[PDB]
Structures are given as structure tokens and as C-alpha cells.
Design a protein around this ligand. Structure first.
Ligand SMILES: CC(=O)O[C@H]1C(=O)[C@@]2(C)[C@H]([C@H](OC(=O)c3ccccc3)[C@]3(O)C[C@H](OC(=O)[C@H](O)[C@@H](NC(=O)c4ccccc4)c4ccccc4)C(C)=C1C3(C)C)[C@]1(OC(C)=O)CO[C@@H]1C[C@@H]2O
Ligand SMILES: Nc1nc2c(ncn2[C@@H]2O[C@H](COP(=O)(O)CP(=O)(O)OP(=O)(O)O)[C@@H](O)[C@H]2O)c(=O)[nH]1
Ligand SMILES: Nc1nc2c(ncn2[C@@H]2O[C@H](COP(=O)(O)CP(=O)(O)OP(=O)(O)O)[C@@H](O)[C@H]2O)c(=O)[nH]1
Ligand SMILES: Nc1nc2c(ncn2[C@@H]2O[C@H](COP(=O)(O)CP(=O)(O)OP(=O)(O)O)[C@@H](O)[C@H]2O)c(=O)[nH]1
Ligand SMILES: [Mg+2]
Ligand SMILES: [Mg+2]
Ligand SMILES: [Mg+2]
Lengths: 213, 88, 430, 426, 430
């Protein structure tokens, strides 16, 4: 989804929102603000207008990202869930990418509803972070791979196929977006590899395990 | 800046329309913009994204009235041809 | 209830303001410390202790020109916070004073200007003193003007500026800055008053008979003209020209607001005992090609509006006689659409003489303001210099480094060309 | 009111304490004979913090001096400011416990710890409100490292509610004059971690570095090294004895230095140490003191702070400066070197100001720094200890002096746990 | 018959009290020996032989700060029983000030307070000066206020506190004490004015030009504010405001009693001879979001209520004109449910200038007690720091080891969050 970098691109974000609103008065977007250095969902909040950005304080010097919020995800048991997939990058030259057949599906602890001004503050129904949902009273710890707030991605895929959904196409497009992210992100890694491990000098080989959300 | 000028002189992108002064002005403007963009204001030199912007501008200058995918790619092909001539 | 605020910006503005305020203090009897040993209300604000503080703010993006004011003779006169100074000089760069260094000092100047305006009930306009061909005087002046319209909209913005000479220059980057200041002096000003140093040098050499003059005499002449402009707001006389009547009688069309200033009874002490400086003589001396303070031939163009500000022992009948005889010679030709092109003001106060000056004591003086189409000749040479410099991109990297694009260069050149076209076309007859 | 009882142990402790007592007596204006000859009304207000008023305007320190060798007692007694001490506070043995920690902790120290504690109780009970104790010793010998552990273990249970400091000298790897010395250190750190409220690591090689580099001293001696330790000792407790804008007692320093109970090892420093021919070329300001106070060159411990990150910083300024300048300087450090600071402690620096400066000087600071880099010292000793323990070396002495094999392993486990827990918060 | 009793706790409290009582002695004309060489029967009591004993108790947990007063310039001023000191300080520990050492000295302070309050006929209320993150100044103040409310209910208790600064701080355990002490401020104090050291440093640098200030200048500024508040009780004049009157007018709801204090004519005695301090000038300077004594900006808040206290040559006509002018401005905006958002008060006594100070002998001065919703920013900042430690459970073992349970921290956090939401909800529009 389209993104803006604060505080550098705040004016561009405001101008774009204003122009689209003028073009479409019925347009009621929802944006999500996430800190660059923030992890585990800390500092991430939801806004409906560019003016809703908290621009008064000492915490605004940190760069942030404003992103178009996906207001309509798939819901399983009326709970919006995200998928953590483990991807192996074997080498940059030649490029080698491997994708695990199973992942971890993390579910929200509250029923999902479309973003409204009355439920923006409800982080449990809008954030799928495990560290944030674990403190909720509705979090369920289950040893089964198909129940609880944390499940296996293969189980979710097979439940989806039980409704007649082509899981092969789903897996194909997951593979496509994963490979697309890796190729989009590779060139800076080749630059960093050259900077840190110059050609002609002894050095170890490198690989990585990445968690795609 | 020496790297940019060597690149320009190697892939022969310079011509009557684009002289050395214009190349230097473009380099200075791009470097200043990308240094100011980052949180740290030193950024002594040019990162990769600024080089991507410069390559986009150069590809826009050449091969006019062409799609963007055809652009950049055409300039890459020309630069590779000139490099192959250079090493050969 | 007729207060005016002056904004001396840049080195040239500061050292013209020194002479301006010396002359003002002498005229109104104010000592260099602020105590008199009404008329003084336009330029001075009175406090409880009887101390008169000047109604002006000094701004420069460097200390070296202001500390002389703060440690000189007139050090107890100005408010300590009205002398605003920066830390790093603009280094003859428009972008330096408009985008990078001048952006850190604009807030203090705006706050002090708002503080000054809070003390005025009959505020009339602003008297911006600056100079083209300089980093601060071209960039910070633009920033200040732009924002002084966003804030005070209907107020007047009178501009006194120094223009580059035909062949006598100081910096190799003068055409760039002077072209870039065209936007601000065009669509953020009401009357742009221009003077170049070469013409005042010639005037000093011929009239006052000074072989090697310097900036002080030039600034004193500028102060005399500025005092003549506002001499009606403070003193009393027969015909009084207000600030708004001046520009409603001098500016024909909105974009044509670039008058020309002249001061006739410019004479040394020795050569004044022999010449009877009657009203006709000085009135004719105003209409002399070798007497204008911008190097341009007034016979190579039209005459649109004329304002004659008389001070001293001037009876209106003699003014009518001088105007009548002026409209007889064919060497001074006007525009057919202005059958009446003469505005007259008469005030009683004679001009004053500062100690250690180069101007003789006289009992009548005339300041002449002319809206002539001979300024395009001045702009054309500078435009040619700019094109020659810009054909091979020269010094442009300095401007681009501080945050300016080449679109600014192109647009400024186009704007100047359009203004020149407008001036050339307004001279046609129909 | 709020008096401190001083204890010296070993040769190193006795010499450092003698220099310290000369320093404090000069500061408070005390004759070597014991009289007061000074020009101030503030030198005698809180004199009841180190001294006791005897008959006829005589002042006598606390100064419990202990040793297992009766040579250091004679050295201290016949020596500058050596009759200033009470005659019966000298508790001395008959043999210096060799260089054996077992001897001074189990056999020779046992027959003298009760004798010491009698005089310790006798002085304490003559106090209006005992703030605490402080011990000066070295962790490389038998008498020092053994007595300063046995005595501290029995002083802590007797007065659990008081304050206990220790200006210990941690053994250095390069400057080594003892063979069995790592053993002693490994057997002491684990008792200097649960029995003392504060502990200052004073490594000797850092003192030599300061003398060679900062002071341009060709030939330093032990007196020059002890001068710095005495300066830091005085700067730690200035706010208990002279007035200030922001006072900082010992307990106030403790409360904002240790985030957790066992993180009480610090790095000392003294701000205006310059030279004798560079003085004229300097200006005595707050910013320059803060610059020569936070450098990995003015620190009295041999571990680079750049290798770790500070958890907390103290700064007991002494002089007639301004508070705004101090606050501005502290905000610049933290903003400049952000990486060298724990993120989960905002404003890690604790400040203080005392008007009266040390004599001659018009401005000084004492920097106390809790840093994770201190773990280096421990991980520098353990290795040596292991190098001598896998092949049992010099262990017959300790084994025959009553100890058993398991104590060494327990001590190594405790020290390793301390290193790991200091590394946890890095 | 208009008596107020002063209490000063901690080093900050005692030093502020020194400044304040020197100011009162200078004002009413009392030598440091308590004997003059009426208006004093509100801070002083007259014995048989002309002595004037102040009605204040100095309490501290450590001897040095009080002992400085015991042997100083004002030695023979306080009844030595009124000077109270302990044996050991709280060591920046709220637990020590509330549960371990404060309870050991709570009897003497109450006995002296009773002895002082039995010597008055009508008691307006107590005054309490302290800190917010200091240990003794938090814990012992909490204990004292908790018992004072029980013993003297339905009686005013106004407190002046030094809130922790957003950036500079002199301690590492500051947020813990600050968060734990905002329960008696919320539920045991009838009013509370908080000032920030950083704001006073900025004011001293910008206005008084004091490059390197110390705590004495800050304390003198607080003394000026406190004298401004209690001026309609001692001296007479125009419209007079007592404690109950402005307490009613400035506290809309019982949970909102956190105003901000402002002193407009802060002049370095060198800019005084260059500007006039009219009623409009000082009234505007009060509302300027730079001359504020805490680090909050009203521009990101709404002005809930306003109290203006004028001293000197002030007439109601100028006050009304200035209030109207403030009303017209749209940059500063009030909430909607107070059409009349001001309570004004005029006194005749000019402010007193102490020797060796930083102020100037002005003719009129104004003190602003402004209730806005911007304070929610400041607390928030402090709030953040607090949890940034509490997540790692840092420094908690000290507080736990002195009779304080683990639940108090979370209770105070929840209380402070509730107060923040309460202050935010009143800013909504109808
Ligand atoms: C040329 C000159 O001006 O000499 C000064 C002096 O200022 C210098 C040389 C002094 C001098 O110190 C040293 O030479 C020195 C040598 C080795 C190790 C430590 C110090 C001085 O000895 C130290 C002495 O300082 C004091 O008097 C302090 O009050 C100090 N006094 C003692 O330690 C002391 C105690 C008992 C008997 C004699 C001295 C002190 C410091 C902290 C707390 C209490 C007291 C002074 C002014 C000097 C000399 C004499 C050269 C310095 O002293 C200190 C530690 O502040 C070393 O760097 C500082 C500043 C100067 O460079
Ligand atoms: N007639 C006068 N011309 C002046 C005076 N001072 C400067 N100048 C002219 O101005 C030009 C130089 O520009 P300035 O140095 O005055 C401009 P400023 O100081 O504002 O720019 P920076 O160099 O960026 O500081 C040059 O033509 C000078 O002859 C003056 O007092 N009178
Ligand atoms: N700074 C000082 N370090 C010292 C001094 N004396 C010794 N040392 C250092 O400490 C170590 C030896 O300390 P001591 O001889 O005082 C130990 P102690 O006498 O307590 O042990 P025993 O051998 O059991 O008697 C060794 O590293 C020495 O270089 C001294 O006066 N000052
Ligand atoms: N504006 C002022 N703030 C002060 C002053 N003295 C201290 N403080 C502030 O108080 C805070 C430090 O805590 P205090 O000095 O109040 C400690 P207190 O004596 O109350 O308790 P103990 O810890 O038991 O000594 C910190 O914010 C200082 O800036 C002063 O004179 N003026
Ligand atoms: Mg200049
Ligand atoms: Mg020994
Ligand atoms: Mg205190």
C-alpha cells in the first residue's frame, strides 16, 4: 500500500490526501502510522485525517511511515489474522531464494470491524502482533495446530480449500510477492556485501532467514 | 564526483546537449537533496538510491517518447555496449 | 498617527540608515542619545523618561556591520533588540540568504516588526532599505517582503535600493542576484526607488566638485532624498502629499512602479554665492540628463508621471510658472494619454545641513520623481550580462548547492523580459 | 552528625589511608599535632564526621588501622601525620599471612578479627548517628584481600542498616608483582558483591597511565598514585561536610547508581588533572572539566568505556559555578554520545554541587560511572584463574591452610554469574 | 485576621522560602532582626516588645540547609522552634520520606502548626513550597498534606511545586517520585502552581540577559509571583481578590486546579530605558507563548480560564481595553462555555526590587494565573519517562525495601492516566 515518510513527506501526504478527497468526497481512507525504529507494535496507531497526526511533542523527531491501512482483510472466525513466513536467502550471486511450505498464522484477540473513529484506539482488533495480543484476556494458548490464536499456515490453507478456494494460486502469489520483495531489496545488499567483504579478500559466505509478514 | 565524471566519460553519455557543467550541477543537487533527506545531515557522498535517481534522469533525457520500462533498460544496454568496447 | 517603519537590511542598508537617522535626529532636534534639549511622531516613539526610540529595525546576516552601530556615536538611540544580527555572512549568494542562513533569522525580525506595529495607530507603510547585487539584500529582502504581505496586506511597501552601474561593479555574481530579486521587487512592492553608485559619483564630481568621493557622501544624498519624500508627514506646508496620494499620482498601471529620483539644488559652498538658485533654475536642473541618479538618458523615452516635492520658500505661483515653461520645450516629451502629468507638493521646512557635509545651505529645494520609460535601457544591459554569464553555466553550482533550482533562473529571466516588453509597449501613442 | 568510621587494611590500605588522612587534615585545617589552625568558620561545622573531640581542642580520627605484619604500623606511626592517630587503634599481628588468602581469612585473620571488632564497636558507639564505614584495601594479597572480606562479612551482619564502601585495588594483568594473586582476587570478588553497598575499582595501571600521559611525570611513585585515590575519596563525601546548592549524601548517590542490588562497581575520576607547565594554557570552566571527566583517558580503571555503555553517571562538582551551565553540559554529553548510554534510563547523569573547592583549586569534579565495560576486568581475571586451576598450581598452600577444592569452583561460578549479569544489560 | 501560614519542605522549599521572606521583609519594612525601625498581620505576628515573628515553619530531613539559615543574615528572625531539621535525608527516596523517616518527624511539625494556627483569628489557608521529584519534598509533603487535610478540612491549601523539566534533570529517580507524588496534589491540595527550571532558564537568558544564572534568580522570580498572589490581602487598592475568590474563579471543576504562572515585565534594567510598559504591552507579553514559566505551549491547547493581577499605576479602563484586544485575536482561543473568561484584580502597591537582583524598578506589573489544557503535554512527557524504566523494573528495589508495596507504582500510573483523560475531555467542543 502507498506510503509516506514523515516528517520529510508530510506536505506531499497532505496534498495527496486533499486532492483525492476533492476528487472523491465519499472517500474515507484509514491510515496507519508506524515508527521506523519501533518494534512489537509499539508506537503504531491509526488515523483518519492528516491533521490527526500528533505533531506536538519531542517524539516527532523520529522518522515514521504512514501507510494505507488494509480495511478489508480476510476474516477467519471473525478474527483478522496475519501470516509470518520463513524465507531463506541462500546467496546474492547467484540469487537463491527458498520458501518454507508452512508458516505461523497469528490471529487477533477481538472480532474485526471496519475502521471507524469509535474503534481506532482498539489495538487488539487492529494489530496482529503476538507480543501485544498475548497480554489480551482473549488470547488462547492451544497445542493444536488448527486452534488458538497461533496456528499453522498449512492448516489455514486447508480450511480455505475446504470452502473451494484454489490454494495453489494462493501459494503461487505468495511466492511471487516474496521473490519480488527479495529482488527489490537485493541491490543494496550487494552494495553492502561489496563494502563489507571486498572482492579478492578472504571472507565467509552469508545466508539469512527472514520473517515475512 | 570523480566517480560520476569517470562514469560519464566511460559510457559516453556526455554530448553537446549535456556538458560537464550540467553533470556537476545535477550531481550537486541530487547529493544535497539525498543528504538532507536522511536524519543525519552529513551523508558525505552519494548513496545507491541517489544513483538510481541520477540514472532515471539520464534515461529520461535519452530515448524520448518511449515507455519507462523501455527507458532505463535502453540506457543500461548502451552503457554495457560502451563498457564492452572499453575493456575489449 | 502617521507612523512609518523603515527596515534597513544588509550592509548597504545599514550604512545608509546611519546617515538617514543622523539627518532625522538633526531635523527633529533629537540628540544622539535620545533626549530633546507632534512632528517627531512619524519616525520616533516617546517613552516616559522623555527618550525617543527610532521606529526601525536593523537586520544583517553578519555582525561586523552592526557592532559599529552598537559601539558608535548612535549607540544609546536604537533599541538593543532592534539591531538583529546573524552569525554567518550570506557570501554574495541569493540562495544563502533566501533558503539556508536567512531562514534561521526571519522569525526574530518578524516578531520585532509585529512589536513595532503594535505601537502604531496610524501606520502608513514600510521603508525598505536594501541593495541588489548582494546575498542578504537580495535573499532576505525577498523573504521579508513575501511574508510582510502575507501579514500586512494593504500597507504600502516603498523600496529604496542600489542598482548595478553600467560598467562599475563590485562582484562577479551581481547580475544573478539582481535578476533574482526582480520577482520580489515586482509583485511585492508599490514603488521601487532605484539609484546606482556611478551616477552619484558623477554628480559628486561635477556638482559638489569632489575629486575622490566615497560611500558616505552617497548615503547623505540618499538620506536627503528620503527626507524630502516624507517631509510632508512631519512638517506643515501649503500642498501636502501623503504617502498614498504619492503613489496614486505616480503609478499609472499596477506593474509600472519604478520611478526615478532627482535632487536639484546640489551645489558646493563656493559656487553657491554666485548662483541665484531660483525656483525656475532648480526646476530646470531636475530635467537634466546628467543629473539623474540612474545612468540613463531621459530623452530616450517617454514621461508618464511627475511629482515635484518643494521644501522651503516656494510660493505656488512660481511653481505654476516653472511647470508652464517646462511644457514649452520639445526636448522633454510626454505621453499623449497624460495631458496633466505634474503633481505638486509644497512644505515650509527648508533642508538642513549636517556638520562636516558637502552640501551648502539653501532656502529652497525640490525633489523630482519621474515615471519614465528610460529604465528599460538600464535593465537591458544587465539582462545581456546575465545571458552572457549563463550561456556557459557559471557559478550556478554555488546557487544549486544551497537549495535553488535552475527553474528560478529561467523564470526570473522570463519575468524581466515580460516587464521590459510591458515598459516598451506602454510608450506607444494612440 | 552523620559520621563515618574509617578502616585501613594491609600495606596498600595503610599507605592510601595515610595519604587520605593528610589530605583531609589539610582540607579541614588540622595541625599534625592534632590542633586546629585554620581560617574559616565552615571547616569546623561538620568536623564531627571524621574526627573526635578529645581534651583541650584536640581532634583524633577514627582510623582503625589493621595489618598482620607489624612493619606497616611502624611505618605509619613514624611518618608525616603519624602521631595524629589514637595509640590503641593499631591492631597488628605477628606475621604477614604470606601472600595467602586462606591464612588471612581462616587462621591468622580469625585470631585478630575479634580484636579489631572490639575497637570498631568502641568507636561506632561514640557516634551520634553513624552514616557508615569505608575500607581501603587491595584484592591481591592475603592480609588485605582476606581481612577486608572477613571484617566486612562480620561488620555487615552487625550493622545491616548502615552504609559500607570499599576503595579496592583490582589486580592488573600487565603490572603484576605477585604470582598467586589471581587466586586471591577470584576468592574475594564473590564476597565483595553481597557485603558492601559500594565498591570502587582502582586499577594501578590506569593510575600509571594518568601519571605518564596527563601529568607528564617521568618518575612516579606510590605517593603520586595514592594522591589520586585520596582526591576521589574526598570528592565522594564533600557534600556531607560542606554546604551546597544540591547536596548529595552517600545514600543519595547509592539510590541513583545501582539499578539492581549487585551492580555496585564504579569507575572514579578527577576533573582538573592537568600538568605543571600546561596550567597557564588552560581555562578552568565547566565544559572543559566535563570533557576531561568523560574521556577514556582520565579514568582510574583499566577498561575502555567505548567497549560498553554507561548505566548511570554521577558528577559531584565542587566550586562556585552555575546550575544552568552544568545542566546544559550534561544535556550535551547525552545528546552527543547517544550510543554510549543505556536507552531505558533517561538522563543517566546524577549531579551535585558543593561551594567549597579544594584548596588552591577554584573548581573540581568527581566522576563516578557505572558501566558494563567493567565486566572486562572480571573476565580478564577469570581466564588467568582458569589457566592456573585446571592444572592445580600453588594450591597446596590453600588446601593445607584449611580450605577445600569446592570453594574455588564456587568463587569462579559467582564471578562468571556477575560477568554474565553485567553483560545482560548491555 | 487575614493570616496565612507558610510551609517550606526540602532544599528547594527552604531556599525559595529564604528568597520569599527576604522579599516580604523588604516590602513591609522589617529589619532582619524582626524589629521595625496593619499590613503585616498576615505573614508576621507581633510580640510585646515590637518583634515580628514570621508565620512559617521550615522543615527538612537533613541539617545543612536549615543550619545555613540558623547562622546567617536572618538568624534572629525565626523562632528557633519553627526551624525544624532531622538527622538523615530521604536520599531521593519517596519511601523514606513517607514510610520510614517522615513518620518519625510528623509530630513536631503538626505541633508547631497547631501552635501557629491557634495564634490567628481568621486563617485564609496554608501555603506549601516543595519539589516534585526530590524525595523529602515528595514523600514528606504527601504525609504532611494527608494529615493537614484531616486536621484542617474545609481550609485552603495552596502549593507551589517545581515540576521536573522535560530535558534537563538533576536526578535519575525523578520520574518515580514525580509519579508517586501526584496523588496528594490531585486529591489533597486546593490549588497547585507548577514551574519548570528550564523555562526560567530560558526566560532569564532571553529577557534578563543573564548568561549563567544560578538558583537565586529562579527563587527570586518565584518570590515575585508569590508576592503578587498575596498582595490584595496585605495592601489595599482597587478591585481586590482574596484566596477564595480566585480559587472559585479559576477552578471550574474540583479535579482541574493546575494553573500556570506568568510575570510579564521581566526587564534587565537596560532595556527599561528603551521601551514603555503600558497595560496593553504587559498584558500581551503575558499571553506570548515564550514568556511562560513551564515548558508548555498554549497554541496546542485551549485557555480554560484566566486570572490577571495588576500592581502599580493601573486603571480599569486600560485593563478593559487590553482584555478586548486579547479577545479579538484568533491565535489565542478560549473554550466555548466561558463567555466571560477573565477575573481581574488591581492593587496599588508597586513591586519591590531587592538589592543585587536582576529586575528593574517598573511602575506597573501584571501576574497571570492561566488555566489551560496544554499542561497535559508536560505530564505526558514525564509519564513517558516513568514507564520507560518501570518496564525493566529498574531502581524499584530501593522503594520496595522501605515499606512500600509494588502496587503503588501501578496505582499512581493509572491515576495519572485518568487525570490526563479528564483534562483532555474538557477540551471538546459543545
Ligand atoms: C603549579 C600549580 O599550580 O600546582 C598546583 C596544581 O594546581 C596542579 C599541578 C596539582 C598538583 O598535583 C600534582 O602535582 C599531582 C601529582 C600526582 C598526582 C596527582 C596530583 C599539586 O600537587 C596539588 C595542589 O592541589 C591542592 O592543593 C588540592 O587542594 C589538593 N591537595 C592535596 O591533595 C594535598 C593534600 C595534602 C597535602 C598536600 C596536598 C586536593 C585535591 C582534592 C581534594 C583535596 C585536596 C596544587 C594546587 C598544586 C600542586 C602542589 C603541584 C594537580 O592536583 C590535583 C590532583 O588537583 C595535578 O593536576 C592538578 C592541577 C594542577 O596541575
Ligand atoms: N551607494 C552605496 N552602495 C553601497 C553601500 N554599501 C554597499 N554598497 C554597494 O552594494 C554592493 C555590495 O553589496 P553589499 O555588500 O552592500 C550587500 P549585503 O552586505 O547585504 O550582502 P552580503 O555580501 O551577502 O552580506 C556594491 O555595489 C557596493 O558598492 C553604501 O553605503 N552605499
Ligand atoms: N597503590 C599502591 N599499590 C600498592 C602498594 N603496596 C602494594 N601495592 C600493590 O598491591 C599489591 C600488593 O599489595 P600489599 O603488599 O599491600 C598486600 P598485603 O600486605 O595486604 O598482603 P600480605 O602479603 O598478605 O601482607 C601489588 O600489586 C602491589 O603493587 C601501595 O602502597 N600503593
Ligand atoms: N527552582 C529550584 N529548584 C530546585 C532548587 N533546589 C532544588 N531544586 C530542584 O529540586 C529537585 C531536586 O530535589 P530536591 O533538591 O528538592 C531534594 P529534597 O531536599 O526535597 O529531598 P532529599 O532527597 O531528602 O534531600 C530538582 O528538580 C532540582 O532542580 C532551587 O533552589 N530552585
Ligand atoms: Mg554583507
Ligand atoms: Mg603485607
Ligand atoms: Mg536535599
Amino acid at each position: 500500500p502507498r506510503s509516506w515518510i514523515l516528517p520529510d513527506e508530510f506536505q506531499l501526504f497532505v496534498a495527496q490526501v486533499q486532492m483525492v478527497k476533492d476528487d472523491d468526497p465519499s472517500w474515507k481512507p484509514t491510515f496507519i502510522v508506524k515508527p521506523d525504529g519501533g518494534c512489537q507494535g509499539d508506537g503504531i496507531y491509526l488515523i483518519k485525517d492528516p491533521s490527526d497526526i500528533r505533531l506536538a511533542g519531542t517524539l516527532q523527531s523520529r522518522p515514521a511511515v504512514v501507510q494505507e491501512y488494509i480495511c478489508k482483510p480476510l476474516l477467519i472466525d471473525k478474527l483478522k489474522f496475519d501470516i509470518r513466513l520463513y524465507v531463506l536467502l541462500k546467496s546474492l550471486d547467484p540469487l537463491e531464494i527458498y520458501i518454507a511450505k508452512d508458516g505461523l498464522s497469528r490471529f487477533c484477540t477481538e472480532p474485526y470491524q471496519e475502521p471507524t473513529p469509535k474503534n481506532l484506539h482498539r489495538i487488539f482488533m487492529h494489530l496482529t502482533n503476538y507480543s501485544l495480543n498475548i497480554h489480551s484476556g482473549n488470547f488462547i494458548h492451544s497445542d493444536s495446530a488448527s486452534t488458538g490464536s497461533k496456528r499453522t499456515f498449512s492448516s489455514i490453507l486447508c480450511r480455505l480449500s475446504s470452502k473451494g478456494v484454489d490454494i495453489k494460486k494462493v501459494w503461487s502469489d505468495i511466492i511471487s510477492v516474496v521473490i519480488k520483495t527479495v529482488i527489490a531489496l537485493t541491490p543494496e545488499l550487494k552494495v553492502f556485501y561489496q563494502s563489507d567483504i571486498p572482492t579478492g579478500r578472504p571472507g565467509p559466505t552469508c545466508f539469512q532467514i527472514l520473517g515475512f509478514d | 564526483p570523480t566517480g560520476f565524471r569517470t562514469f560519464i566519460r566511460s559510457c559516453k553519455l556526455s554530448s553537446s546537449s549535456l556538458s560537464m557543467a550540467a553533470v556537476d550541477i545535477l550531481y550537486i543537487d541530487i547529493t544535497r537533496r539525498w543528504n538532507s533527506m536522511t536524519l543525519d545531515q552529513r551523508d558525505s557522498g552519494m548513496c545507491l538510491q541517489a544513483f538510481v535517481e541520477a540514472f532515471f534522469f539520464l534515461a529520461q533525457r535519452k530515448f524520448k517518447m518511449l515507455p519507462l520500462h523501455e527507458q532505463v533498460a535502453s540506457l543500461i544496454d548502451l552503457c554495457e555496449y560502451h563498457l564492452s568496447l572499453l575493456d575489449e | 498617527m502617521r507612523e512609518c517603519i523603515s527596515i534597513h537590511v544588509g550592509q548597504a542598508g545599514v550604512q545608509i540608515g546611519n546617515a538617514c537617522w543622523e539627518l532625522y535626529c538633526l531635523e527633529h532636534g533629537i540628540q544622539p542619545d535620545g533626549q530633546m534639549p507632534d512632528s517627531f511622531n512619524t519616525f520616533f516613539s516617546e517613552t516616559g523618561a522623555g527618550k525617543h526610540v527610532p521606529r526601525a529595525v536593523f537586520v544583517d546576516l553578519e555582525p561586523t556591520v552592526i557592532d559599529e552601530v552598537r559601539t558608535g556615536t548612535y549607540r544609546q538611540l536604537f533599541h538593543p533588540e532592534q539591531l538583529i544580527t546573524g552569525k554567518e555572512d550570506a557570501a554574495n549568494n541569493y540562495a544563502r540568504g533566501h533558503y539556508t542562513i536567512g531562514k534561521e533569522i526571519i522569525d526574530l525580525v518578524l516578531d520585532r516588526i509585529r512589536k513595532l506595529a503594535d505601537q502604531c495607530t496610524g501606520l502608513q507603510g514600510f521603508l525598505v532599505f536594501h541593495s541588489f547585487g548582494g546575498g542578504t539584500g537580495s535573499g532576505f529582502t525577498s523573504l521579508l517582503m513575501e511574508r510582510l504581505s502575507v501579514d500586512y496586506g494593504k500597507k504600502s511597501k516603498l523600496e529604496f535600493s542600489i542598482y548595478p552601474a553600467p560598467q562599475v561593479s563590485t562582484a562577479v555574481v551581481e547580475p544573478y542576484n539582481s535578476i533574482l530579486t526582480t520577482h520580489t521587487t515586482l509583485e511585492h512592492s508599490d514603488c521601487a526607488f532605484m539609484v546606482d553608485n556611478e551616477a552619484i559619483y558623477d554628480i559628486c564630481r561635477r556638482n559638489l566638485d569632489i575629486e575622490r568621493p566615497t560611500y558616505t557622501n552617497l548615503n547623505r544624498l540618499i538620506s536627503q532624498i528620503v527626507s524630502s519624500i516624507t517631509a510632508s508627514l512631519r512638517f506643515d506646508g501649503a500642498l501636502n502629499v501623503d504617502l498614498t496620494e504619492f503613489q496614486t499620482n505616480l503609478v499609472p498601471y499596477p506593474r509600472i512602479h519604478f520611478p526615478l529620483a532627482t535632487y536639484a539644488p546640489v551645489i558646493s559652498a563656493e559656487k553657491a554665492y554666485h548662483e541665484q538658485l531660483s525656483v525656475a533654475e532648480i526646476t530646470n536642473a531636475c530635467f537634466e540628463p546628467a543629473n539623474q541618479m540612474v545612468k540613463c538618458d531621459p530623452r530616450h523615452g517617454k514621461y508618464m508621471a511627475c511629482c515635484l516635492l518643494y521644501r522651503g520658500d516656494v510660493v505656488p505661483k512660481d511653481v505654476n510658472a516653472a511647470i508652464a515653461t517646462i511644457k514649452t520645450k520639445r526636448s522633454i516629451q510626454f505621453v499623449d494619454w497624460c495631458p496633466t502629468g505634474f503633481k505638486v507638493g509644497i512644505n515650509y521646512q527648508p533642508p538642513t545641513v549636517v556638520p562636516g557635509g558637502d552640501l551648502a545651505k539653501v532656502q529652497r529645494a525640490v525633489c523630482m520623481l519621474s515615471n519614465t520609460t528610460a529604465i528599460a535601457e538600464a535593465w537591458a544591459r544587465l539582462d545581456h550580462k546575465f545571458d552572457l554569464m549563463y550561456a556557459k553555466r557559471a557559478f550556478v553550482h554555488w546557487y544549486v548547492g544551497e537549495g535553488m533550482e535552475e527553474g528560478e533562473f529561467s523564470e526570473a529571466r522570463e519575468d524581466m523580459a515580460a516587464l521590459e516588453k510591458d515598459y516598451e509597449e506602454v510608450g506607444v501613442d494612440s | 552528625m552523620r559520621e563515618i568510621v574509617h578502616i585501613q587494611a594491609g600495606q596498600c590500605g595503610n599507605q592510601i589511608g595515610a595519604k587520605f588522612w593528610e589530605v583531609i587534615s589539610d582540607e579541614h585545617g588540622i595541625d599534625p599535632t592534632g590542633t586546629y589552625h585554620g581560617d574559616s568558620d565552615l571547616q569546623l561545622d561538620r568536623i564531627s564526621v571524621y574526627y573526635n573531640e578529645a581534651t583541650g581542642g584536640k581532634y583524633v580520627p577514627r582510623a582503625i588501622l589493621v595489618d598482620l605484619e607489624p612493619g606497616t604500623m611502624d611505618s605509619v606511626r613514624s611518618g608525616p601525620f603519624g602521631q595524629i592517630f589514637r595509640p590503641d587503634n593499631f591492631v597488628f599481628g605477628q606475621s604477614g599471612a604470606g601472600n595467602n588468602w586462606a591464612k588471612g581469612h581462616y587462621t591468622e585473620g580469625a585470631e585478630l578479627v575479634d580484636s579489631v571488632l572490639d575497637v570498631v564497636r568502641k568507636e561506632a558507639e561514640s557516634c551520634d548517628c553513624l552514616q557508615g564505614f569505608q575500607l581501603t584495601h587491595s584484592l591481591g594479597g592475603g592480609t588485605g584481600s582476606g581481612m577486608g572480606t572477613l571484617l566486612i562479612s562480620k561488620i555487615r551482619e552487625e550493622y545491616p542498616d548502615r552504609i559500607m564502601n570499599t576503595f579496592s585495588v583490582v589486580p592488573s594483568p600487565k603490572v603484576s608483582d605477585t604470582v598467586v594473586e589471581p587466586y586471591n582476587a577470584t576468592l574475594s570478588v564473590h564476597q565483595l558483591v553481597e557485603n558492601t553497598d559500594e565498591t570502587y575499582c582502582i586499577d594501578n595501571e590506569a593510575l600509571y597511565d594518568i601519571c605518564f600521559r596527563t601529568l607528564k611525570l617521568t618518575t612516579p611513585t606510590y605517593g603520586d598514585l595514592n594522591h589520586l585515590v585520596s582526591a576521589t575519596m574526598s570528592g565522594v563525601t564533600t557534600c556531607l561536610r560542606f554546604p551546597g546548592q544540591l547536596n548529595a549524601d552517600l545514600r543519595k548517590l547509592a539510590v541513583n547508581m545501582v539499578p539492581f542490588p549487585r551492580l555496585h562497581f564504579f569507575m572514579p575520576g578527577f576533573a582538573p588533572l592537568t600538568s605543571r607547565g600546561s596550567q597557564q594554557y588552560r581555562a578552568l570552566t565547566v565544559p572543559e572539566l566535563t570533557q576531561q571527566v568523560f574521556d577514556a583517558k582520565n579514568m582510574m580503571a583499566a577498561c575502555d568505556p567505548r567497549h560498553g555503555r554507561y548505566l548511570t553517571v554521577a558528577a559531584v562538582f565542587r566550586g562556585r559555578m552555575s546550575m544552568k551551565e552544568v545542566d546544559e553540559q550534561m544535556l550535551n554529553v547525552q545528546n552527543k554520545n547517544s550510543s554510549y548510554f543505556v536507552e531505558w534510563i533517561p538522563n543517566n547523569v546524577k549531579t551535585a554541587v558543593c561551594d567549597i573547592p579544594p584548596r588552591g583549586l577554584k573548581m573540581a569534579v568527581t566522576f563516578i560511572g557505572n558501566s558494563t565495560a567493567i565486566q572486562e576486568l572480571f573476565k580478564r581475571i577469570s581466564e588467568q584463574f582458569t589457566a592456573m586451576f585446571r592444572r592445580k598450581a600453588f594450591l597446596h598452600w590453600y588446601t593445607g591452610e584449611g580450605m577445600d577444592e569446592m570453594e574455588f569452583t564456587e568463587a569462579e561460578s559467582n564471578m562468571n554469574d556477575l560477568v554474565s549479569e553485567y553483560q545482560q544489560y548491555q
